[PDB]
Amino acid sequence: KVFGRCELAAAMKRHGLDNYRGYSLGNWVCAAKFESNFNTQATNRNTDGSTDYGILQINSRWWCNDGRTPGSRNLCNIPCSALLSSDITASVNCAKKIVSDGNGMNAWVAWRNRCKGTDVQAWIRGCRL
Ligand SMILES: [Au+]
Ligand SMILES: [Au+]
Ligand SMILES: [Au+]
């Protein structure tokens, strides 16, 4: 599923990402834009043979099992295909674990490079939240 900006804002807010670990809703929307272009089906291979999955490009190296990242961790206790569904529940609940692990949203390279320090509020402009 490819979410509209305000649609994803509203889902992310409903799923309790609004100021989660102090990260305003705009930060999460911005991350999802530049990680996946709001596409729940997005998959991208990493140099180490791991793969990033879903609207928040969660990495098989640590967070999920994709059956082809041998000697990796599955810290969200899911198959990586769960991260690709039209329902963002599994991506959100796993993101909450990632962001909480002491690195905050720096785990998202696109967030760090394209969102961090910027006017992220612009990403929720116009939305009825
Ligand atoms: Au959720
Ligand atoms: Au949802
Ligand atoms: Au994020």
mmCIF file of C-alpha atoms and ligand atoms in Angstrom:
data_model
loop_
_atom_site.group_PDB
_atom_site.id
_atom_site.type_symbol
_atom_site.label_atom_id
_atom_site.label_comp_id
_atom_site.label_asym_id
_atom_site.label_seq_id
_atom_site.Cartn_x
_atom_site.Cartn_y
_atom_site.Cartn_z
ATOM 1 C CA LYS A 1 0.000 0.000 0.000
ATOM 2 C CA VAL A 2 1.259 3.557 -0.784
ATOM 3 C CA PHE A 3 -0.017 5.857 2.007
ATOM 4 C CA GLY A 4 -0.963 9.497 1.492
ATOM 5 C CA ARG A 5 1.105 11.838 3.721
ATOM 6 C CA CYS A 6 -1.835 12.809 6.014
ATOM 7 C CA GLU A 7 -3.152 9.189 5.908
ATOM 8 C CA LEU A 8 0.211 7.891 7.262
ATOM 9 C CA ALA A 9 0.427 10.801 9.766
ATOM 10 C CA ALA A 10 -3.009 9.737 11.089
ATOM 11 C CA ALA A 11 -2.143 5.977 11.251
ATOM 12 C CA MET A 12 1.220 6.692 12.951
ATOM 13 C CA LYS A 13 -0.533 8.997 15.494
ATOM 14 C CA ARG A 14 -3.268 6.375 16.128
ATOM 15 C CA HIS A 15 -0.443 3.763 16.677
ATOM 16 C CA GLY A 16 1.163 6.062 19.352
ATOM 17 C CA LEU A 17 4.285 7.294 17.471
ATOM 18 C CA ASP A 18 3.280 10.982 18.240
ATOM 19 C CA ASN A 19 6.239 12.178 20.522
ATOM 20 C CA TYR A 20 7.378 8.534 21.067
ATOM 21 C CA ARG A 21 10.854 8.813 22.756
ATOM 22 C CA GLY A 22 10.424 12.610 22.214
ATOM 23 C CA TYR A 23 10.254 12.309 18.367
ATOM 24 C CA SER A 24 7.356 14.437 17.032
ATOM 25 C CA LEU A 25 4.965 12.898 14.449
ATOM 26 C CA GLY A 26 6.672 14.962 11.651
ATOM 27 C CA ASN A 27 9.974 13.097 12.268
ATOM 28 C CA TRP A 28 8.294 9.670 11.661
ATOM 29 C CA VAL A 29 6.409 10.926 8.517
ATOM 30 C CA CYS A 30 9.652 12.478 7.175
ATOM 31 C CA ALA A 31 11.554 9.174 7.891
ATOM 32 C CA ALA A 32 8.837 7.084 6.077
ATOM 33 C CA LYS A 33 8.895 9.502 3.068
ATOM 34 C CA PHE A 34 12.694 9.210 2.538
ATOM 35 C CA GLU A 35 12.993 5.513 3.615
ATOM 36 C CA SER A 36 10.049 4.035 1.543
ATOM 37 C CA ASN A 37 8.183 6.908 -0.204
ATOM 38 C CA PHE A 38 5.234 5.788 2.060
ATOM 39 C CA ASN A 39 5.158 2.358 0.300
ATOM 40 C CA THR A 40 4.568 -0.590 2.721
ATOM 41 C CA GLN A 41 5.964 -3.021 0.038
ATOM 42 C CA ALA A 42 9.461 -1.333 -0.211
ATOM 43 C CA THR A 43 12.494 -3.735 0.051
ATOM 44 C CA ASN A 44 16.205 -2.714 -0.327
ATOM 45 C CA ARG A 45 19.274 -5.030 -0.032
ATOM 46 C CA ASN A 46 22.196 -3.839 2.222
ATOM 47 C CA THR A 47 25.914 -4.475 1.329
ATOM 48 C CA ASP A 48 26.223 -7.058 4.191
ATOM 49 C CA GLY A 49 23.525 -9.359 2.590
ATOM 50 C CA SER A 50 20.802 -8.084 5.031
ATOM 51 C CA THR A 51 17.640 -6.390 3.639
ATOM 52 C CA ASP A 52 15.523 -3.374 4.790
ATOM 53 C CA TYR A 53 11.705 -3.995 4.832
ATOM 54 C CA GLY A 54 8.550 -1.902 4.749
ATOM 55 C CA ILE A 55 7.426 1.714 5.236
ATOM 56 C CA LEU A 56 10.303 2.217 7.811
ATOM 57 C CA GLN A 57 12.935 -0.011 6.068
ATOM 58 C CA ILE A 58 13.584 -2.225 9.165
ATOM 59 C CA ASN A 59 16.824 -4.256 8.803
ATOM 60 C CA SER A 60 16.951 -8.151 8.795
ATOM 61 C CA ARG A 61 20.504 -7.806 10.322
ATOM 62 C CA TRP A 62 18.885 -7.160 13.787
ATOM 63 C CA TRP A 63 15.074 -6.865 13.807
ATOM 64 C CA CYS A 64 13.338 -9.622 11.726
ATOM 65 C CA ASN A 65 13.947 -13.049 10.055
ATOM 66 C CA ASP A 66 13.836 -13.109 6.205
ATOM 67 C CA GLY A 67 15.417 -16.626 5.968
ATOM 68 C CA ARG A 68 18.451 -15.265 4.007
ATOM 69 C CA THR A 69 20.432 -13.128 6.582
ATOM 70 C CA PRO A 70 22.378 -16.014 8.189
ATOM 71 C CA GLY A 71 23.756 -15.372 11.726
ATOM 72 C CA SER A 72 21.481 -12.263 12.187
ATOM 73 C CA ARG A 73 19.179 -11.305 15.131
ATOM 74 C CA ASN A 74 15.339 -11.209 15.156
ATOM 75 C CA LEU A 75 14.840 -8.702 18.035
ATOM 76 C CA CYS A 76 11.232 -7.889 16.946
ATOM 77 C CA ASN A 77 10.450 -11.681 16.875
ATOM 78 C CA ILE A 78 8.746 -11.469 13.393
ATOM 79 C CA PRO A 79 9.263 -12.632 9.819
ATOM 80 C CA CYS A 80 10.365 -9.580 7.698
ATOM 81 C CA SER A 81 7.282 -10.177 5.424
ATOM 82 C CA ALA A 82 5.100 -9.009 8.432
ATOM 83 C CA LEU A 83 6.762 -5.559 7.873
ATOM 84 C CA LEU A 84 5.360 -5.365 4.292
ATOM 85 C CA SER A 85 1.578 -5.587 5.044
ATOM 86 C CA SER A 86 -0.896 -2.700 4.273
ATOM 87 C CA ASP A 87 -1.433 -2.521 8.067
ATOM 88 C CA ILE A 88 1.581 -0.690 9.659
ATOM 89 C CA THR A 89 1.032 -2.239 13.200
ATOM 90 C CA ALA A 90 4.060 -4.610 13.022
ATOM 91 C CA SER A 91 6.345 -1.883 11.487
ATOM 92 C CA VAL A 92 5.290 0.625 14.241
ATOM 93 C CA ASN A 93 5.635 -1.802 17.223
ATOM 94 C CA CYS A 94 9.104 -2.876 15.897
ATOM 95 C CA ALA A 95 10.154 0.816 15.255
ATOM 96 C CA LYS A 96 9.273 1.560 18.943
ATOM 97 C CA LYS A 97 11.789 -1.148 20.004
ATOM 98 C CA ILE A 98 14.490 0.184 17.577
ATOM 99 C CA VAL A 99 14.156 3.887 18.580
ATOM 100 C CA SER A 100 14.248 2.873 22.323
ATOM 101 C CA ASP A 101 17.568 0.965 22.074
ATOM 102 C CA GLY A 102 19.730 4.096 22.851
ATOM 103 C CA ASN A 103 20.457 5.238 19.229
ATOM 104 C CA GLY A 104 17.061 6.980 18.809
ATOM 105 C CA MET A 105 16.098 7.718 15.164
ATOM 106 C CA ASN A 106 19.826 7.759 14.069
ATOM 107 C CA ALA A 107 19.217 4.045 13.150
ATOM 108 C CA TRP A 108 17.332 5.469 10.096
ATOM 109 C CA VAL A 109 20.084 6.727 7.705
ATOM 110 C CA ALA A 110 17.447 8.674 5.652
ATOM 111 C CA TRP A 111 16.108 10.343 8.840
ATOM 112 C CA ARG A 112 19.646 11.359 9.938
ATOM 113 C CA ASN A 113 20.512 12.684 6.419
ATOM 114 C CA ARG A 114 17.197 14.294 5.314
ATOM 115 C CA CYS A 115 14.978 14.931 8.431
ATOM 116 C CA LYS A 116 17.196 15.520 11.533
ATOM 117 C CA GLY A 117 17.546 19.243 12.380
ATOM 118 C CA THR A 118 15.000 20.229 9.611
ATOM 119 C CA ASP A 119 11.467 21.717 9.926
ATOM 120 C CA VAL A 120 9.766 18.230 10.276
ATOM 121 C CA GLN A 121 6.421 19.941 11.320
ATOM 122 C CA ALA A 122 6.017 20.704 7.525
ATOM 123 C CA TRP A 123 5.365 16.929 7.019
ATOM 124 C CA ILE A 124 2.038 17.121 9.053
ATOM 125 C CA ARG A 125 1.019 20.609 7.617
ATOM 126 C CA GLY A 126 -2.624 20.602 6.373
ATOM 127 C CA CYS A 127 -3.527 17.217 8.050
ATOM 128 C CA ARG A 128 -6.622 16.856 10.366
ATOM 129 C CA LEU A 129 -4.887 15.044 13.282
HETATM 130 AU AU AU B 1 0.931 0.099 16.446
HETATM 131 AU AU AU B 2 -2.361 1.266 10.927
HETATM 132 AU AU AU B 3 12.114 6.481 12.392
#
